[PDB]
Amino acid sequence: SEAVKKWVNKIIEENIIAVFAKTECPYCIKAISILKGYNLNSHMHVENIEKNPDMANIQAYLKELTGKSSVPRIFINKDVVGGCDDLVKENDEGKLKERLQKLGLVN
Ligand SMILES: [Fe+3]
Ligand SMILES: [Fe+3]
């Protein structure tokens, strides 16, 4: 499906911060909370791909784009951040703040 790919693409391209998640997903919730902690709400979109008839297609495409099919899947300005563990590594090592500074999202 070109449709599925185009839909995922629109989410990644129209939102600087894009998070693909699922229902009752602790590491989705943790990653989303970290990002909101940087006051990124206005530029974030969270998509629950479990509430979707094409979940498996979406997951397979996210694997093609990022190397993993699991949620959460996190993109920042179309760059692959990865999962919540990747986000925690970038956050602790100063890379997440640098990303956001280059985007004008944090001073
Ligand atoms: Fe449950
Ligand atoms: Fe949505």
Side-chain angles (χ1 to χ4, degrees), residues 3-4 7-9 11-94 96-101 103-106:
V4 174
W7 179 89
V8 172
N9 287 349
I11 289 166
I12 300 175
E13 292 182 284
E14 298 182 344
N15 305 283
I16 299 178
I17 312 291
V19 180
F20 298 85
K22 78 175 176 172
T23 305
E24 294 172 0
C25 170
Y27 287 98
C28 303
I29 289 157
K30 183 184 175 83
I32 291 164
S33 289
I34 291 173
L35 288 158
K36 289 190 177 179
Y38 276 90
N39 190 48
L40 302 183
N41 316 46
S42 64
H43 289 289
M44 292 173 71
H45 188 65
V46 173
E47 189 69 33
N48 181 343
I49 68 173
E50 184 172 4
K51 293 172 172 333
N52 194 294
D54 303 313
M55 185 187 192
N57 300 131
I58 298 165
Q59 280 181 271
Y61 184 43
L62 292 174
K63 189 172 193 178
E64 293 179 4
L65 291 182
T66 76
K68 297 196 188 154
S69 59
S70 54
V71 289
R73 293 279 96 207
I74 304 163
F75 301 79
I76 293 186
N77 191 34
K78 304 170 282 181
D79 299 317
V80 176
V81 170
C84 180
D85 291 0
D86 299 306
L87 186 69
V88 166
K89 176 177 173 59
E90 289 199 5
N91 192 34
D92 288 7
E93 293 176 352
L96 175 54
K97 185 172 192 168
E98 280 187 88
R99 270 191 209 275
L100 302 171
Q101 285 175 322
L103 299 168
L105 291 171
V106 303

